[PDB]
Structures are given as structure tokens and as C-alpha cells.
Amino acid sequence: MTQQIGVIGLAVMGKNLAWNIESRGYSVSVFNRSSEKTDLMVEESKGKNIHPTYSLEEFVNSLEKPRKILLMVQAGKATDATIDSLLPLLDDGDILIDGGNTNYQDTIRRNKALAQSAINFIGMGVSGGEIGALTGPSLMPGGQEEAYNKVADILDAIAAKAKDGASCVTYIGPNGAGHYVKMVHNGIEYADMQLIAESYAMMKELLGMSHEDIAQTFKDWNAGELESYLIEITGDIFMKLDENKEALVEKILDTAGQKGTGKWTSINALELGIPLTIITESVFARFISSIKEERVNASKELNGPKASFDGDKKDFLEKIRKALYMSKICSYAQGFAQMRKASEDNEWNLKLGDLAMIWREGCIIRAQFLQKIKDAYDNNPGLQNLLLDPYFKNIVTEYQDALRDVVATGVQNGVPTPGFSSSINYYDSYRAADLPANLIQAQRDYFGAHTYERKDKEGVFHTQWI
Amino acid sequence: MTQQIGVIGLAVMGKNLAWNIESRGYSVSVFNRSSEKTDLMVEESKGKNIHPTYSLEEFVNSLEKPRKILLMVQAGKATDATIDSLLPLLDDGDILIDGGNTNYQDTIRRNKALAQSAINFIGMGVSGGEIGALTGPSLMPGGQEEAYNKVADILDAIAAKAKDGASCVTYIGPNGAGHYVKMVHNGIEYADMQLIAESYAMMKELLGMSHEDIAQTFKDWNAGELESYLIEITGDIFMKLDENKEALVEKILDTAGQKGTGKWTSINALELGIPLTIITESVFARFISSIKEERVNASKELNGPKASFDGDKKDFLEKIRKALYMSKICSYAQGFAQMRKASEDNEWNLKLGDLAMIWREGCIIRAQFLQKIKDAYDNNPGLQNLLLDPYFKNIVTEYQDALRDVVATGVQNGVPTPGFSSSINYYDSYRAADLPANLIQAQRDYFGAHTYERKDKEGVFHTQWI
């Protein structure tokens, strides 16, 4: 007569999560604003413990208490409108879980507002696409720790399982912490795709490789330290042919968009004073790709060198592999340094090792790589930068030669490598004891009397430079 | 008895602006929260038409109507607190001018709120430092056009004069357009200083040049197309010697900090979808310089190549000069693309040629370069990107080969060049008819079913890739 958990929002994401929950033995009530999707789901859920409802009151009244409601509603105003319609119906102690791709500052606001009405609110990042939601996604719940423990068994049952049996879910932290790390996950994802895109650009523009050999190269890399879901599907993408038996990827319009959510990772890093150069270059690279009409016109006006390579191709192909691996290391080092700073500012007490562990499966950035990040934070929780961990330090110390040659060869041949370039520039800046910022300080004291410090003595100084 | 204009805030910027206004023959009332700064100005204003007031009531009562009041108050809550205290004392039609370094969104809010009380509010960017404020700054007033025309003669009198006689002030646009333009100026300034720092880094760590030859190099560069205030003061800075006749700039702690406001330009570009790579890398470079202790520890664990150069050092110096000029062109091309986008989104109807015109003198980024930007827009008001202007296109299509040599040499020798690198990557991306973003679109369709467009056919497509 009463169901254990309810799901609001019966699009592809919400319906798959409801089926995921039901497949684990739980009874699920479902509701959608348009009853068209509810009637369809019953058509596809015969023999399953799915209880359809056609009103918010009947939905709320069909749930066990404390009520556990999963919100899979369109992000933004639509989520707030569903919340404000649920509040007069809920009782004290009920648990609301928002699983959309939400701005973490909205989760902070909703958590703070609903807490005043004795309502628990969990902002949960969900990664894995539509197939991940059905079989096992990576889950990043943040909010009241007490409320998470009431739904921990459910989230554990539906989450993806790593090879060691651990499910890809854990309590992230208070209020908006869960949606925050999901945002950083997307930013990290932007860099990974951009670094793969630059590897493909070098293979095509510089080495003149065909789509069959590009696919095999990515498959070969996927068998080693670079193994990841993104590298794996890239190998499949370069094997898909169209109707005329030609590579379909080469026919796709190269416009990535200007309205993605990856920019919010970069904006937050700028607010926190964190140098997130590689992800931000990846965001900007998507902006550049969207002005296709301007780029075509500019190509007829601004010339450049003719890309050519007269060395050993498979040896340079190995340098690109090493450049790709080291660049991702630098990119993750920046992303995890951002989360460390965000955790301190928001007092979230984030366990970054545990976060790397739940990204091993389920999510888009899943990679064998993430195991080494966990081990870095487990052998040194006070780690300030991943580049200092002995495993990553030994990799980048060796791989920098390949990254330097890949960047130098790309610049010399007119192939844009924004991710590779910012990675080596970050490595050379982070390891530099003395930077040319002393001249910037002198100029600021010159025209603005901003004063400066000295390595010589202590104190603050101001100088008449003329 | 009554004065023509009033100044609130008698710190160095407000005091010098009041003296600037008075020197043009206008009567000025002054007020400061702490009366001691007012009393010190009375001492230094003997024989000048400066009338000191010691309360907001006496201050407002000493001004002719419509009252013209210049606010030089600490940015942030200090400005709102002063405005809120002024509102009941003012009459309909009075004109408040905020000349601080204000977030343009605060100006938009204040302009909208004060317009409900029939009070005009001009947000005005002011650039030039202390010397500029006293003798002639660059002024960027935005707000009510009718209110600007009532104070235009005063602003025209005090503003810097360009070499053709034109004052470095003009009506930027409605509400916060003036403060927005000031923010972009500061972002451009960040990039100019970072590009000069990288040139210095190459000269010292790669070419092994002493401070005397570094100073002479910048003075020689200033005598050419790179003529700029920032390059001019850079030559003077390397001439400044301490007690032991050592370059004082070499003893300055290389920590630019994160307390600057350049990050706001980058954040705005990310919200607008504008590729502001060069300025943003300059902002991030200041962040990396601020973590000095971390960098000192990283320098003992992360090794890199030993820099060395055996070629002709005079020829490479000329390549650094060309790379610096082209990098400025790319940086300004990005910043003027940002202003064009902000004009469209905010309905400001900005005239970018007028902006380059008023930056020819007074401000910090003043350079002969800005006359060429003015010429570019006066020759073609519909110019879509500075890289397409005949003069600039002729420069970058030749200087690119010097920029490529400089970036490649810096990368191979471990000298970080984030400004030079993002410059050549922007040139190669903006001119690329085909970017590798097609693979990104295929990936997004693989794991997320985000659909894609095609180059040959038309419409929206979706593919099962396996």
C-alpha cells in the first residue's frame, strides 16, 4: 500500500533511475508533470514494482515516512517550482534528493531554505549518461549527513560497482558539496576530450594518418596506462562509417557550443584564485569552435605554415601518447587543487581520495588513472599537488621531454595545441622558484604605488623609480 | 557661496581629481569621512578654489543645481553606504558620478535604483594613477546620456589630451558600460604586463642578459612600433640600482597576488562565451606566482631542462620583439571581441573605435598601438576582428614565424611563456577552417546523445556508434 521511494521526472534520466532502483528490489512510486510519460512507463514496466501516480498529493501520500523523493526535473526554475509545490505536502524529516545537473550555489540556497522547514535536501551529482543511470551510475550526494545515512543503502545498491566490489557512491559533504564535485567532474571531462582532440589533430594534420589507423592507435593506448572510457569510445568513433562507407566523424560539423556548463568550473577557479589553465583552455577552445563562419572567412585571409613531418612517425606517435598522459596528470592536479581550495572555503572536509575512487566506474571520466590519484591521497592526505606524488612525479619528470617536443612541433607546423601548451607552461611555472612576477610588482609600484616585498629583507617597500 | 562641483573621498585619487578640476577654473567643494584628510587638503590647496565641508549636509548645500557630485570612495559597501546617505539630501535631476574601480554589475544595480528616485548616476572608469588623476586621466563615463552631456564640459576639461588634441573621454554607453570598459582595460593591462614579463624571462634565463642590456633593449623597443607607457617604465625599472649598484628589481619578491580585479574580465568572458585565452592565462600566471612557498618546494622535486642558447642572440632578441608585438595584437583582438559581445548582450551600442581613441593617452595601456586600432575601426566600422584589419593582418602574417620560434625555443628550454603560447594558439585556432571539435561532438553524441550537425547535409543527426 506504501512505496519505499518516489521519483519525480520521467524523462530518460529519471525513468532509468526508477528502473535501476526497482531492479534492486525496492518499490517505487513515480510521477511526471505530463501524464503522457507516466502512462508510457507503465507500458514498459509490466511485472515491475512501479506505482504510477497522477498528482503530487497522491505521489507524496504513497511514500513511506521519512519520505525519500528523487527529483529528476529540468534544472533551474523548474526544479524550484517542483520543490515549492512539494513543501506544503511534506512532513518534518522528509528527504528530497535533487539528481539534476544543478549549479551548486542553487543547492546551497535550497538546502538552507528547506532546512528552515525541517526538510532534508540532498544535492546529488549523477554521471554515466542514460545507460549509466539504468545499470549503475557514479553518485555524488551532498547535504545533511543524517539524511544521507537514511538513503545510503539505496544509493549503494544502484551505484556502479568497481572491480574491488566498492560501489561508486559516498557522502561528499554538507549542502552543495555533491553538486560541486560533479561540476568539477564536467570540467575535468572538458579537458580530457580536448586533450584527445589535440592528439587526433596531431595524428591527422601532422602525421597524415587515416581513420583506420587513428582508431587502432587509440585502441593501443587504451590497453596501457591511458585506459579510459573516453579513449575507448574514441577508438569506436573512428571505426563508424556512414552510408557511403566513409568515416562519419570527418563529416561532423566542428562546433562544440558556447553554452556548456564546463565554464562554471573555470569561473569558480577564478573566484578562488586557483590556476585552472588546462580546463579553461578547453572551455575557450569550445568557444573558438563555435564561430565556424568567422573561422572559414579568416582561413582565406590569415596564412600559416604547411604542416609536414619527416621523422619516424611511430616514435612521434609515442611522444603524443606521453604528452597526452602527462597533460591529463597536470589537468587533474589542477582540478583536485581546486577542490581542495573549495573544500576549505566551504568547510566541506572533502576526502579527495574517496572522490577519485567513486569515479573509477559509472562516470564519463572513468579511467584506471583514478586509482593512482586515490593512492596519492591515501599515502599522503596532506598532499598539496598531485605532481608531488612519487608516482606522478616520476612520470612527468620523464614524459616532459615528449610533451615539449609535441608542443614545439605543433607550434612550428600551425597545429593548435592549447591543452598541451598550457600543460607544459603550468609544469614550468609551478616548478619555477623564481618567476618574472618581480617585474610585474615593480611596474605596479611604479604606476600605482602598490608597494612590494623583497626576498632580500623583510617588510613592505615603496620606491621612487626615477 | 555655491560651488560648481563636489568631490567626496579625499584619498590620493579624489584629492588629485579635485585639484585637476580646480586647475581648469571650476569651483570645487570637498568632503571626506575622516575630517583629517579634509584638513590636510586645506593646507595643500592655498590659493585654490577648494571649499572644505565636514558633513554630507553642508557638502550638498554648497553645490549649485543640478548638483554634480564625484564619488571617489572605496569600492564596494563603502560606496553604497555613501550613496544611501546622500539620497535623502539630493533633489530630482542631480548627478552622482562614481569614479571608483567598481564592478559594473554594481553600477547597473545603482543606476536602476537611483533612477527610481529621479537621480542620475554615472559610473565612470578612471585610469592613469596619481599622476594621471592630477594632470589628465582617461575617463570612461557610462550612465544617462542626458546626465553625461551636463558634465561633459568638465570631463573634457580634465581628461588627457591625445596628440591630435582630442580629449580622452567620451560617452561610453548606458548604465554600467563605462565601468565595464574600465574592467576590460585592466584585463588588457594584465596581458601587456605578462607579455613584458615573459620577454624579460627569455632575455635573462635564455639569453643570459644583464640588467643593463635588458634596460637598453626595452628602451630601443620603445623607440619603435612597441612604443607604450608600460615598456617605457620597464626600461626605467631595470635602470634602478640599490646601494651595491645591483638591479633593485631582482631583489623584489615575485608574488603578484590574487587580490587583483583582472579575474572579473576573465569571468565575464566565460559567461559571454568569448575566447579570452591570453588575458586569462595572465590572470592565472598571477595566481601561480602567489604560491611562492609551494613553488620553492616544487623546484627541489620537479626538474626540467637547463636553458641554453648558442645561436645569434641579436637575431633572437628581434624575434622576441616581434613575438611581443604580435601577442599584443592577439590580446587586443580578444579583448575587443569581448567588448563587442558585451555591447550586444547589454544593448550598449558601443563604438569600439571611440574606445581605442580615448585609450591613446592617460590610461596605463596607452601606446601608439591604440592609434592603429582607432585607424582600423575608422577605416572599417564593421570590422569583425582586429586580425582582419589590413595593417594588423600584414603584421601577424609575417611576425608569426618569429612567434613560433620564440614559443618553441621557450618550451624546449623550460621557460614558461603562457602569454606567447596562447597567442600563437589563438592565431592558429581562429584561422583554422577545420578544428578537431568534430570529434568532441561525436563523443558527446556517443555518451550523452546530444546530437550533432554535419558539414555536407543539413539538419540535426544522431548515431548509434557501436
Side-chain angles (χ1 to χ4, degrees), chain A residues 2-242 244-258 260-292 294-466, chain B residues 2-465:
Chain A
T2 324
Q3 264 65 29
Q4 293 163 297
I5 188 157
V7 175
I8 290 181
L10 296 188
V12 60
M13 276 297 295
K15 176 161 71 232
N16 277 5
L17 281 186
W19 283 336
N20 194 345
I21 296 162
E22 199 277 329
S23 72
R24 315 300 178 163
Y26 296 105
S27 55
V28 177
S29 291
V30 291
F31 171 85
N32 194 82
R33 174 189 55 165
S34 318
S35 64
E36 64 215 20
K37 294 188 170 63
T38 311
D39 298 323
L40 173 156
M41 188 175 173
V42 191
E43 198 216 82
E44 311 171 331
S45 305
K46 179 209 242 208
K48 298 177 167 180
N49 228 304
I50 304 289
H51 184 63
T53 62
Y54 298 95
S55 89
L56 267 196
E57 283 92 345
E58 188 205 6
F59 171 81
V60 165
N61 288 332
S62 76
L63 298 182
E64 92 197 329
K65 303 164 71 262
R67 299 195 167 84
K68 300 151 185 170
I69 300 178
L70 179 56
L71 294 182
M72 298 302 300
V73 158
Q74 143 169 279
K77 264 87 172 308
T79 299
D80 279 309
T82 315
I83 289 177
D84 295 329
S85 307
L86 281 175
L87 183 53
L89 316 173
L90 300 176
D91 305 332
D92 293 4
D94 285 357
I95 303 165
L96 274 185
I97 307 177
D98 173 31
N101 210 46
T102 311
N103 166 38
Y104 79 100
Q105 292 176 307
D106 284 341
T107 296
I108 291 174
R109 163 179 57 80
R110 292 161 187 164
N111 179 90
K112 178 182 161 66
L114 288 172
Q116 286 163 348
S117 303
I119 301 290
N120 295 284
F121 187 77
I122 295 173
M124 184 169 69
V126 179
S127 184
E130 92 154 70
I131 296 101
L134 178 61
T135 66
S138 183
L139 300 175
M140 294 142 263
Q144 283 95 350
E145 187 181 325
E146 199 165 88
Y148 162 83
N149 284 330
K150 301 238 193 57
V151 306
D153 286 340
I154 297 98
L155 302 186
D156 182 273
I158 67 178
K161 304 291 190 300
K163 299 171 178 60
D164 54 8
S167 58
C168 292
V169 62
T170 205
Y171 178 63
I172 307 302
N175 44 86
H179 276 143
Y180 185 88
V181 301
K182 180 48 170 47
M183 176 189 76
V184 174
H185 165 281
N186 287 345
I188 289 175
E189 165 192 308
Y190 273 46
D192 287 342
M193 300 166 63
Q194 173 63 26
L195 292 170
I196 291 171
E198 282 168 41
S199 304
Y200 150 62
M202 297 288 278
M203 285 180 235
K204 168 160 149 124
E205 322 275 60
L206 188 60
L207 299 180
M209 290 164 65
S210 64
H211 70 264
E212 301 99 319
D213 300 326
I214 288 171
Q216 194 51 64
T217 291
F218 279 114
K219 291 177 190 303
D220 289 344
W221 295 356
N222 200 42
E225 59 207 357
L226 267 172
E227 184 274 318
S228 77
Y229 170 78
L230 281 171
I231 297 274
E232 175 198 343
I233 71 165
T234 300
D236 285 350
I237 281 160
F238 279 101
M239 295 297 314
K240 165 56 53 84
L241 322 174
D242 54 12
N244 322 327
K245 305 103 177 51
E246 322 172 352
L248 173 65
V249 65
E250 296 302 326
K251 307 193 158 352
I252 297 183
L253 186 62
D254 48 320
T255 54
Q258 263 172 341
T261 60
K263 59 170 76 187
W264 296 116
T265 308
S266 298
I267 288 176
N268 170 258
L270 283 153
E271 291 175 6
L272 296 176
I274 289 295
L276 200 86
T277 62
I278 297 150
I279 286 160
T280 306
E281 284 281 354
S282 301
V283 172
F284 282 143
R286 289 201 188 191
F287 297 166
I288 275 278
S289 71
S290 266
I291 49 159
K292 169 88 175 183
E294 276 195 42
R295 292 195 276 106
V296 173
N297 174 250
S299 69
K300 312 180 203 305
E301 301 289 340
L302 309 167
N303 47 79
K306 173 56 203 109
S308 71
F309 192 71
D310 299 332
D312 188 32
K313 302 235 187 301
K314 74 171 149 253
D315 271 21
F316 192 80
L317 210 46
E318 176 58 29
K319 301 185 177 189
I320 297 171
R321 195 196 65 76
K322 293 184 167 99
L324 180 59
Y325 195 50
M326 166 162 174
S327 288
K328 156 178 259 165
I329 290 178
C330 293
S331 181
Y332 275 71
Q334 294 179 341
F336 274 70
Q338 176 184 355
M339 292 189 282
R340 169 64 61 230
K341 217 278 187 280
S343 180
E344 177 209 87
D345 271 27
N346 292 272
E347 298 180 299
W348 283 333
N349 196 3
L350 291 184
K351 295 294 200 270
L352 298 187
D354 291 359
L355 183 59
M357 284 307 229
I358 63 170
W359 286 349
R360 287 177 301 162
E361 302 286 349
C363 66
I364 303 297
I365 66 171
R366 77 183 84 124
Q368 150 190 149
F369 188 67
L370 291 146
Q371 179 72 54
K372 279 102 174 194
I373 293 181
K374 169 62 171 345
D375 285 335
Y377 287 102
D378 263 29
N379 307 334
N380 185 17
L383 186 71
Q384 289 173 244
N385 194 285
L386 280 178
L387 293 171
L388 300 181
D389 172 78
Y391 169 80
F392 296 114
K393 180 212 300 187
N394 292 336
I395 289 286
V396 303
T397 292
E398 176 189 353
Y399 283 21
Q400 63 172 305
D401 303 308
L403 179 54
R404 285 175 202 287
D405 301 340
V406 166
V407 167
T409 307
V411 166
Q412 219 67 246
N413 287 275
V415 178
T417 65
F420 286 164
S421 295
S422 60
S423 296
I424 191 66
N425 286 317
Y426 174 71
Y427 177 79
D428 285 329
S429 296
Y430 182 70
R431 80 182 172 86
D434 292 320
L435 278 173
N438 56 319
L439 176 56
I440 289 177
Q441 286 296 95
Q443 290 156 341
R444 289 178 76 254
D445 186 62
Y446 192 113
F447 62 71
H450 281 100
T451 75
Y452 61 92
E453 291 179 80
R454 297 174 49 149
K455 342 174 177 185
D456 213 73
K457 40 205 287 180
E458 311 288 320
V460 153
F461 307 83
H462 172 55
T463 300
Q464 321 284 129
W465 298 86
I466 298 303
Chain B
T2 191
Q3 268 59 44
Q4 289 169 301
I5 193 160
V7 184
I8 292 182
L10 299 185
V12 60
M13 282 296 299
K15 207 203 308 184
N16 289 319
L17 273 187
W19 282 339
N20 192 347
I21 293 155
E22 196 282 323
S23 69
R24 320 298 178 153
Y26 295 98
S27 58
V28 185
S29 290
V30 292
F31 169 83
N32 196 87
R33 168 182 63 165
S34 74
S35 63
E36 313 66 77
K37 299 203 182 171
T38 309
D39 289 352
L40 184 91
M41 192 182 184
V42 184
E43 273 312 84
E44 309 165 334
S45 305
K46 288 177 183 132
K48 295 165 161 167
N49 210 337
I50 302 283
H51 181 56
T53 66
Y54 304 88
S55 82
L56 280 182
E57 279 83 3
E58 178 196 8
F59 173 78
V60 166
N61 286 344
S62 71
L63 305 158
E64 78 184 28
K65 335 205 163 175
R67 294 191 181 90
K68 308 166 191 67
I69 292 170
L70 177 59
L71 251 68
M72 293 304 284
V73 167
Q74 172 181 258
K77 284 321 288 191
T79 302
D80 289 304
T82 305
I83 289 178
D84 294 356
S85 291
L86 270 178
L87 183 43
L89 310 166
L90 298 178
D91 296 335
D92 294 15
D94 288 349
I95 301 144
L96 302 179
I97 309 188
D98 171 30
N101 280 251
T102 306
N103 170 27
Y104 81 100
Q105 290 179 266
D106 285 340
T107 296
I108 287 174
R109 169 179 52 83
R110 290 161 190 166
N111 184 88
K112 171 175 299 213
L114 288 177
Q116 273 164 20
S117 317
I119 299 294
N120 298 287
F121 183 79
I122 294 172
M124 185 175 67
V126 179
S127 181
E130 147 154 34
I131 308 186
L134 173 63
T135 72
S138 180
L139 302 170
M140 296 140 264
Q144 281 91 359
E145 186 184 343
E146 183 163 329
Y148 163 83
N149 284 324
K150 286 173 162 52
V151 306
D153 299 319
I154 294 172
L155 306 182
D156 182 278
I158 63 167
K161 307 289 149 48
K163 291 203 287 181
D164 54 6
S167 310
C168 293
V169 61
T170 197
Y171 178 65
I172 308 302
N175 42 86
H179 273 141
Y180 179 91
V181 153
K182 179 52 169 59
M183 177 191 69
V184 171
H185 164 280
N186 285 5
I188 289 173
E189 162 189 312
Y190 272 51
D192 286 345
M193 294 163 76
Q194 170 67 22
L195 295 169
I196 288 163
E198 291 175 22
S199 308
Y200 155 56
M202 295 285 274
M203 292 179 322
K204 184 164 88 74
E205 307 167 22
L206 187 63
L207 304 175
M209 293 168 51
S210 67
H211 61 93
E212 289 116 339
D213 301 298
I214 283 174
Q216 191 49 238
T217 298
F218 280 117
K219 282 156 146 50
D220 279 354
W221 288 1
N222 204 48
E225 67 208 350
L226 268 170
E227 205 301 290
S228 79
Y229 172 73
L230 276 179
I231 288 191
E232 182 204 317
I233 73 174
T234 301
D236 296 338
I237 280 160
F238 283 97
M239 291 300 287
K240 187 64 185 186
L241 267 51
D242 74 330
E243 261 194 63
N244 193 16
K245 315 286 222 220
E246 216 288 292
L248 173 73
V249 65
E250 304 293 347
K251 309 195 183 307
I252 292 189
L253 185 59
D254 52 307
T255 46
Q258 312 169 333
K259 62 267 175 180
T261 64
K263 61 172 74 176
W264 299 348
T265 318
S266 297
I267 286 166
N268 172 255
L270 284 156
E271 293 170 344
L272 289 179
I274 289 309
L276 205 78
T277 62
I278 300 165
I279 286 160
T280 308
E281 281 277 1
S282 300
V283 170
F284 283 146
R286 289 201 185 189
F287 293 170
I288 314 163
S289 78
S290 75
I291 43 156
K292 165 84 174 180
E293 154 179 272
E294 195 168 325
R295 284 193 286 106
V296 167
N297 181 78
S299 70
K300 310 173 197 299
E301 306 285 351
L302 306 178
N303 289 298
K306 184 179 162 42
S308 168
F309 195 78
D310 50 65
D312 186 15
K313 304 183 163 191
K314 187 116 65 177
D315 279 351
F316 192 83
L317 255 189
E318 186 50 39
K319 296 186 174 175
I320 300 177
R321 196 198 64 77
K322 286 181 172 70
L324 172 56
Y325 195 54
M326 172 165 183
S327 287
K328 284 193 53 160
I329 297 168
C330 290
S331 184
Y332 277 72
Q334 292 184 340
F336 274 71
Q338 176 183 17
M339 286 175 142
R340 166 63 48 79
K341 190 60 213 298
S343 170
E344 299 159 339
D345 267 359
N346 293 285
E347 290 180 308
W348 284 336
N349 201 7
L350 297 185
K351 177 41 220 167
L352 309 183
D354 282 0
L355 281 300
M357 168 182 74
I358 68 174
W359 285 345
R360 293 178 297 170
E361 224 64 56
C363 66
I364 307 294
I365 65 172
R366 64 178 179 272
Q368 168 63 30
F369 184 68
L370 280 149
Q371 180 67 58
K372 298 307 291 147
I373 300 177
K374 183 185 189 305
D375 295 333
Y377 285 112
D378 292 354
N379 173 72
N380 178 18
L383 180 69
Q384 293 308 289
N385 185 295
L386 289 179
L387 290 172
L388 303 170
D389 172 73
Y391 166 78
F392 289 128
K393 172 169 66 192
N394 207 259
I395 297 284
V396 301
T397 43
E398 179 193 349
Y399 285 18
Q400 61 168 305
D401 308 323
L403 178 52
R404 293 177 198 288
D405 286 341
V406 159
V407 171
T409 308
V411 163
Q412 295 281 21
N413 287 281
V415 179
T417 63
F420 288 148
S421 294
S422 45
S423 290
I424 192 59
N425 280 326
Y426 177 68
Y427 180 75
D428 285 328
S429 294
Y430 186 73
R431 79 186 171 85
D434 290 333
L435 283 168
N438 57 318
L439 174 59
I440 285 167
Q441 283 298 95
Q443 290 163 340
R444 290 177 73 258
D445 187 61
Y446 195 115
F447 63 75
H450 284 93
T451 74
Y452 61 90
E453 290 182 277
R454 294 178 53 141
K455 292 167 181 162
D456 42 359
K457 275 149 158 268
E458 218 148 38
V460 175
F461 298 85
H462 170 75
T463 307
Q464 273 65 11
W465 294 86

